[PDB]
PDB file of C-alpha atoms in Angstrom:
ATOM      1  CA  UNK A   1      88.490 -93.826  15.843  1.00  0.00           C
ATOM      2  CA  UNK A   2      91.365 -93.380  13.194  1.00  0.00           C
ATOM      3  CA  UNK A   3      94.434 -92.946  14.673  1.00  0.00           C
ATOM      4  CA  UNK A   4      97.482 -90.796  13.282  1.00  0.00           C
ATOM      5  CA  UNK A   5     100.645 -92.859  12.887  1.00  0.00           C
ATOM      6  CA  UNK A   6     102.852 -90.931  15.741  1.00  0.00           C
ATOM      7  CA  UNK A   7      99.846 -90.557  17.639  1.00  0.00           C
ATOM      8  CA  UNK A   8      99.306 -94.437  17.846  1.00  0.00           C
ATOM      9  CA  UNK A   9     103.076 -94.719  18.356  1.00  0.00           C
ATOM     10  CA  UNK A  10     102.696 -92.592  21.442  1.00  0.00           C
ATOM     11  CA  UNK A  11      99.835 -94.322  22.844  1.00  0.00           C
ATOM     12  CA  UNK A  12     101.617 -97.792  22.301  1.00  0.00           C
ATOM     13  CA  UNK A  13     104.543 -96.574  23.681  1.00  0.00           C
ATOM     14  CA  UNK A  14     102.637 -95.398  26.882  1.00  0.00           C
ATOM     15  CA  UNK A  15     101.080 -98.867  27.279  1.00  0.00           C
ATOM     16  CA  UNK A  16     104.533-100.554  27.446  1.00  0.00           C
ATOM     17  CA  UNK A  17     104.952-102.113  23.933  1.00  0.00           C
ATOM     18  CA  UNK A  18     108.186-100.891  22.962  1.00  0.00           C
ATOM     19  CA  UNK A  19     110.365-103.779  23.113  1.00  0.00           C
ATOM     20  CA  UNK A  20     107.734-106.059  24.876  1.00  0.00           C
ATOM     21  CA  UNK A  21     108.919-109.748  24.099  1.00  0.00           C
ATOM     22  CA  UNK A  22     111.762-108.234  22.161  1.00  0.00           C
ATOM     23  CA  UNK A  23     109.524-106.486  19.578  1.00  0.00           C
ATOM     24  CA  UNK A  24     110.398-102.709  18.927  1.00  0.00           C
ATOM     25  CA  UNK A  25     107.718-100.266  18.888  1.00  0.00           C
ATOM     26  CA  UNK A  26     107.853 -99.782  15.239  1.00  0.00           C
ATOM     27  CA  UNK A  27     106.574-103.598  14.716  1.00  0.00           C
ATOM     28  CA  UNK A  28     103.425-102.771  16.600  1.00  0.00           C
ATOM     29  CA  UNK A  29     102.470 -99.767  14.342  1.00  0.00           C
ATOM     30  CA  UNK A  30     103.308-101.421  11.287  1.00  0.00           C
ATOM     31  CA  UNK A  31     100.966-104.238  12.227  1.00  0.00           C
ATOM     32  CA  UNK A  32      98.203-101.992  13.080  1.00  0.00           C
ATOM     33  CA  UNK A  33      98.727-100.076   9.745  1.00  0.00           C
ATOM     34  CA  UNK A  34      98.394-103.157   7.791  1.00  0.00           C
ATOM     35  CA  UNK A  35      95.949-104.999   9.903  1.00  0.00           C
ATOM     36  CA  UNK A  36      93.408-102.303  10.268  1.00  0.00           C
ATOM     37  CA  UNK A  37      94.486 -98.982   8.682  1.00  0.00           C
ATOM     38  CA  UNK A  38      94.888 -97.707  12.236  1.00  0.00           C
ATOM     39  CA  UNK A  39      90.965 -97.799  12.562  1.00  0.00           C
ATOM     40  CA  UNK A  40      89.706 -98.760  16.125  1.00  0.00           C
ATOM     41  CA  UNK A  41      86.344-100.060  14.414  1.00  0.00           C
ATOM     42  CA  UNK A  42      87.783-102.509  11.962  1.00  0.00           C
ATOM     43  CA  UNK A  43      86.382-105.736  11.946  1.00  0.00           C
ATOM     44  CA  UNK A  44      86.617-108.712   9.588  1.00  0.00           C
ATOM     45  CA  UNK A  45      84.897-111.990   9.061  1.00  0.00           C
ATOM     46  CA  UNK A  46      86.482-115.367   8.492  1.00  0.00           C
ATOM     47  CA  UNK A  47      85.403-118.420   6.963  1.00  0.00           C
ATOM     48  CA  UNK A  48      85.998-120.477  10.362  1.00  0.00           C
ATOM     49  CA  UNK A  49      83.202-118.327  11.856  1.00  0.00           C
ATOM     50  CA  UNK A  50      85.389-116.243  13.776  1.00  0.00           C
ATOM     51  CA  UNK A  51      85.942-112.433  13.396  1.00  0.00           C
ATOM     52  CA  UNK A  52      88.792-110.112  13.884  1.00  0.00           C
ATOM     53  CA  UNK A  53      88.178-107.052  15.977  1.00  0.00           C
ATOM     54  CA  UNK A  54      89.609-103.450  16.320  1.00  0.00           C
ATOM     55  CA  UNK A  55      92.886-101.754  15.694  1.00  0.00           C
ATOM     56  CA  UNK A  56      95.157-105.160  16.124  1.00  0.00           C
ATOM     57  CA  UNK A  57      92.440-107.488  14.653  1.00  0.00           C
ATOM     58  CA  UNK A  58      92.110-109.562  17.546  1.00  0.00           C
ATOM     59  CA  UNK A  59      90.605-113.126  16.574  1.00  0.00           C
ATOM     60  CA  UNK A  60      87.404-114.274  18.517  1.00  0.00           C
ATOM     61  CA  UNK A  61      88.281-117.944  18.193  1.00  0.00           C
ATOM     62  CA  UNK A  62      91.213-117.871  20.603  1.00  0.00           C
ATOM     63  CA  UNK A  63      91.400-114.452  22.262  1.00  0.00           C
ATOM     64  CA  UNK A  64      88.153-112.791  23.195  1.00  0.00           C
ATOM     65  CA  UNK A  65      84.415-114.007  23.346  1.00  0.00           C
ATOM     66  CA  UNK A  66      82.124-112.549  20.799  1.00  0.00           C
ATOM     67  CA  UNK A  67      79.193-114.943  21.686  1.00  0.00           C
ATOM     68  CA  UNK A  68      78.973-116.215  18.318  1.00  0.00           C
ATOM     69  CA  UNK A  69      82.324-118.192  17.498  1.00  0.00           C
ATOM     70  CA  UNK A  70      82.487-121.558  17.723  1.00  0.00           C
ATOM     71  CA  UNK A  71      85.239-123.261  19.644  1.00  0.00           C
ATOM     72  CA  UNK A  72      85.885-119.897  21.492  1.00  0.00           C
ATOM     73  CA  UNK A  73      88.848-120.167  24.112  1.00  0.00           C
ATOM     74  CA  UNK A  74      88.805-116.426  25.502  1.00  0.00           C
ATOM     75  CA  UNK A  75      92.512-116.549  26.588  1.00  0.00           C
ATOM     76  CA  UNK A  76      92.369-112.611  27.085  1.00  0.00           C
ATOM     77  CA  UNK A  77      89.242-113.181  29.072  1.00  0.00           C
ATOM     78  CA  UNK A  78      87.422-110.209  27.695  1.00  0.00           C
ATOM     79  CA  UNK A  79      84.267-109.639  25.438  1.00  0.00           C
ATOM     80  CA  UNK A  80      85.495-108.784  21.973  1.00  0.00           C
ATOM     81  CA  UNK A  81      83.124-105.884  22.063  1.00  0.00           C
ATOM     82  CA  UNK A  82      85.638-104.177  24.453  1.00  0.00           C
ATOM     83  CA  UNK A  83      88.089-104.243  21.707  1.00  0.00           C
ATOM     84  CA  UNK A  84      86.152-101.878  19.577  1.00  0.00           C
ATOM     85  CA  UNK A  85      86.849 -99.070  22.143  1.00  0.00           C
ATOM     86  CA  UNK A  86      88.489 -95.807  20.926  1.00  0.00           C
ATOM     87  CA  UNK A  87      90.715 -96.361  23.810  1.00  0.00           C
ATOM     88  CA  UNK A  88      93.351 -98.963  22.867  1.00  0.00           C
ATOM     89  CA  UNK A  89      94.056-100.294  26.536  1.00  0.00           C
ATOM     90  CA  UNK A  90      91.929-103.765  26.209  1.00  0.00           C
ATOM     91  CA  UNK A  91      93.476-104.302  22.622  1.00  0.00           C
ATOM     92  CA  UNK A  92      97.245-103.641  24.042  1.00  0.00           C
ATOM     93  CA  UNK A  93      96.612-105.890  27.177  1.00  0.00           C
ATOM     94  CA  UNK A  94      95.219-108.664  25.000  1.00  0.00           C
ATOM     95  CA  UNK A  95      98.012-108.112  22.445  1.00  0.00           C
ATOM     96  CA  UNK A  96     100.694-108.824  25.019  1.00  0.00           C
ATOM     97  CA  UNK A  97      98.979-112.121  25.914  1.00  0.00           C
ATOM     98  CA  UNK A  98      99.058-113.215  22.332  1.00  0.00           C
ATOM     99  CA  UNK A  99     102.750-112.365  21.871  1.00  0.00           C
ATOM    100  CA  UNK A 100     103.837-113.922  25.189  1.00  0.00           C
ATOM    101  CA  UNK A 101     101.965-117.167  24.368  1.00  0.00           C
ATOM    102  CA  UNK A 102     103.757-118.643  21.538  1.00  0.00           C
ATOM    103  CA  UNK A 103     104.460-117.686  17.963  1.00  0.00           C
ATOM    104  CA  UNK A 104     105.291-114.056  18.827  1.00  0.00           C
ATOM    105  CA  UNK A 105     104.161-111.521  16.170  1.00  0.00           C
ATOM    106  CA  UNK A 106     103.457-114.247  13.856  1.00  0.00           C
ATOM    107  CA  UNK A 107      99.962-114.132  15.299  1.00  0.00           C
ATOM    108  CA  UNK A 108      99.273-111.149  13.008  1.00  0.00           C
ATOM    109  CA  UNK A 109      99.175-112.169   9.367  1.00  0.00           C
ATOM    110  CA  UNK A 110      99.763-108.726   7.984  1.00  0.00           C
ATOM    111  CA  UNK A 111     102.831-108.263  10.283  1.00  0.00           C
ATOM    112  CA  UNK A 112     104.416-111.312   8.968  1.00  0.00           C
ATOM    113  CA  UNK A 113     103.864-110.728   5.403  1.00  0.00           C
ATOM    114  CA  UNK A 114     104.230-106.929   5.130  1.00  0.00           C
ATOM    115  CA  UNK A 115     106.321-105.879   8.374  1.00  0.00           C
ATOM    116  CA  UNK A 116     108.805-108.563   9.028  1.00  0.00           C
ATOM    117  CA  UNK A 117     111.873-108.332   7.056  1.00  0.00           C
ATOM    118  CA  UNK A 118     111.658-104.536   6.632  1.00  0.00           C
ATOM    119  CA  UNK A 119     112.971-101.637   8.622  1.00  0.00           C
ATOM    120  CA  UNK A 120     110.058-101.089  11.012  1.00  0.00           C
ATOM    121  CA  UNK A 121     111.871 -98.577  12.982  1.00  0.00           C
ATOM    122  CA  UNK A 122     111.111 -96.449  10.095  1.00  0.00           C
ATOM    123  CA  UNK A 123     107.359 -96.355  11.336  1.00  0.00           C
ATOM    124  CA  UNK A 124     108.131 -94.274  14.397  1.00  0.00           C
ATOM    125  CA  UNK A 125     110.396 -92.021  12.544  1.00  0.00           C
ATOM    126  CA  UNK A 126     110.014 -88.432  13.486  1.00  0.00           C
ATOM    127  CA  UNK A 127     107.588 -89.048  16.116  1.00  0.00           C
ATOM    128  CA  UNK A 128     109.167 -87.563  19.327  1.00  0.00           C
ATOM    129  CA  UNK A 129     110.923 -84.886  17.302  1.00  0.00           C
TER     130      UNK A 129
END
Protein backbone atom coordinates (compact mmCIF):
# COMPACT_ATOMS: atom_id res chain seq x y z
CA UNK A 1 0.00 0.00 0.00
CA UNK A 2 1.30 3.44 -0.99
CA UNK A 3 -0.23 6.16 1.01
CA UNK A 4 -0.85 9.70 -0.03
CA UNK A 5 0.83 12.48 1.95
CA UNK A 6 -2.23 13.90 3.68
CA UNK A 7 -3.72 10.40 3.89
CA UNK A 8 -0.69 9.26 5.92
CA UNK A 9 -0.67 12.51 7.90
CA UNK A 10 -4.24 11.88 9.01
CA UNK A 11 -3.65 8.28 9.92
CA UNK A 12 -0.55 9.21 11.94
CA UNK A 13 -2.46 11.91 13.66
CA UNK A 14 -5.15 9.43 14.66
CA UNK A 15 -2.56 7.18 16.15
CA UNK A 16 -1.25 10.00 18.34
CA UNK A 17 2.10 10.82 16.72
CA UNK A 18 1.57 14.57 16.57
CA UNK A 19 4.03 15.98 19.07
CA UNK A 20 4.72 12.60 20.57
CA UNK A 21 7.97 13.03 22.63
CA UNK A 22 8.11 16.55 21.26
CA UNK A 23 8.08 15.72 17.54
CA UNK A 24 5.47 17.53 15.52
CA UNK A 25 3.54 15.49 12.91
CA UNK A 26 5.51 16.80 9.88
CA UNK A 27 8.58 15.05 11.25
CA UNK A 28 6.94 11.62 10.94
CA UNK A 29 5.53 12.29 7.47
CA UNK A 30 8.89 13.50 6.19
CA UNK A 31 10.57 10.43 7.70
CA UNK A 32 8.16 8.01 5.99
CA UNK A 33 8.60 9.86 2.69
CA UNK A 34 12.39 9.52 2.67
CA UNK A 35 12.51 6.13 4.39
CA UNK A 36 9.95 4.28 2.34
CA UNK A 37 8.37 6.62 -0.12
CA UNK A 38 5.10 6.01 1.76
CA UNK A 39 5.16 2.33 0.81
CA UNK A 40 3.95 -0.17 3.41
CA UNK A 41 5.77 -3.07 1.69
CA UNK A 42 9.25 -1.61 1.49
CA UNK A 43 12.08 -3.68 2.90
CA UNK A 44 15.86 -3.13 2.90
CA UNK A 45 18.70 -5.50 3.63
CA UNK A 46 21.67 -4.33 5.70
CA UNK A 47 25.24 -5.51 5.78
CA UNK A 48 24.88 -6.50 9.44
CA UNK A 49 22.37 -9.20 8.51
CA UNK A 50 19.36 -7.13 9.60
CA UNK A 51 16.53 -5.82 7.47
CA UNK A 52 14.44 -2.64 7.62
CA UNK A 53 10.66 -3.23 7.39
CA UNK A 54 7.66 -1.22 6.25
CA UNK A 55 6.59 2.34 6.02
CA UNK A 56 8.96 3.46 8.80
CA UNK A 57 11.77 1.05 7.96
CA UNK A 58 11.94 -0.46 11.43
CA UNK A 59 15.16 -2.49 11.93
CA UNK A 60 15.18 -6.23 12.80
CA UNK A 61 18.33 -6.10 14.92
CA UNK A 62 16.80 -4.16 17.81
CA UNK A 63 13.11 -3.69 17.29
CA UNK A 64 11.23 -6.59 15.74
CA UNK A 65 12.08 -10.18 15.21
CA UNK A 66 12.36 -11.54 11.71
CA UNK A 67 13.70 -14.96 12.68
CA UNK A 68 16.80 -14.43 10.56
CA UNK A 69 18.77 -11.58 12.16
CA UNK A 70 21.63 -12.40 14.45
CA UNK A 71 21.71 -10.52 17.76
CA UNK A 72 17.98 -9.80 17.70
CA UNK A 73 16.60 -7.91 20.71
CA UNK A 74 12.91 -7.51 19.72
CA UNK A 75 12.25 -4.46 21.86
CA UNK A 76 8.87 -3.88 20.22
CA UNK A 77 7.97 -7.45 20.95
CA UNK A 78 6.53 -8.10 17.54
CA UNK A 79 7.39 -10.15 14.49
CA UNK A 80 8.71 -7.91 11.71
CA UNK A 81 6.05 -9.47 9.43
CA UNK A 82 3.35 -7.49 11.28
CA UNK A 83 5.08 -4.33 10.14
CA UNK A 84 4.34 -5.11 6.55
CA UNK A 85 0.62 -4.73 6.97
CA UNK A 86 -1.27 -2.09 5.03
CA UNK A 87 -2.56 -0.97 8.44
CA UNK A 88 0.12 1.21 10.13
CA UNK A 89 -0.86 0.55 13.78
CA UNK A 90 1.98 -1.92 14.54
CA UNK A 91 4.52 0.37 12.89
CA UNK A 92 3.34 3.39 14.84
CA UNK A 93 3.26 1.53 18.13
CA UNK A 94 6.79 0.29 17.61
CA UNK A 95 7.92 3.76 16.44
CA UNK A 96 6.78 5.26 19.72
CA UNK A 97 8.88 2.72 21.56
CA UNK A 98 11.92 3.59 19.47
CA UNK A 99 11.66 7.32 20.03
CA UNK A 100 10.83 7.00 23.69
CA UNK A 101 13.90 4.84 24.28
CA UNK A 102 16.80 7.12 23.47
CA UNK A 103 18.17 9.06 20.55
CA UNK A 104 14.63 10.26 19.56
CA UNK A 105 14.16 10.49 15.80
CA UNK A 106 17.81 10.00 15.18
CA UNK A 107 17.00 6.28 14.81
CA UNK A 108 15.80 7.20 11.35
CA UNK A 109 18.71 7.96 9.07
CA UNK A 110 16.60 9.59 6.36
CA UNK A 111 15.07 11.79 9.02
CA UNK A 112 18.30 12.94 10.34
CA UNK A 113 19.85 13.70 6.95
CA UNK A 114 16.90 14.95 4.97
CA UNK A 115 14.24 16.18 7.41
CA UNK A 116 15.95 17.56 10.45
CA UNK A 117 16.81 21.20 9.88
CA UNK A 118 14.08 21.87 7.33
CA UNK A 119 10.65 23.30 7.84
CA UNK A 120 8.89 19.97 8.50
CA UNK A 121 5.56 21.54 9.10
CA UNK A 122 5.41 21.98 5.34
CA UNK A 123 4.78 18.27 5.10
CA UNK A 124 1.30 18.50 6.62
CA UNK A 125 0.47 21.73 4.80
CA UNK A 126 -2.97 21.80 3.21
CA UNK A 127 -4.09 18.51 4.74
CA UNK A 128 -6.93 19.52 6.89
CA UNK A 129 -7.96 22.36 4.65
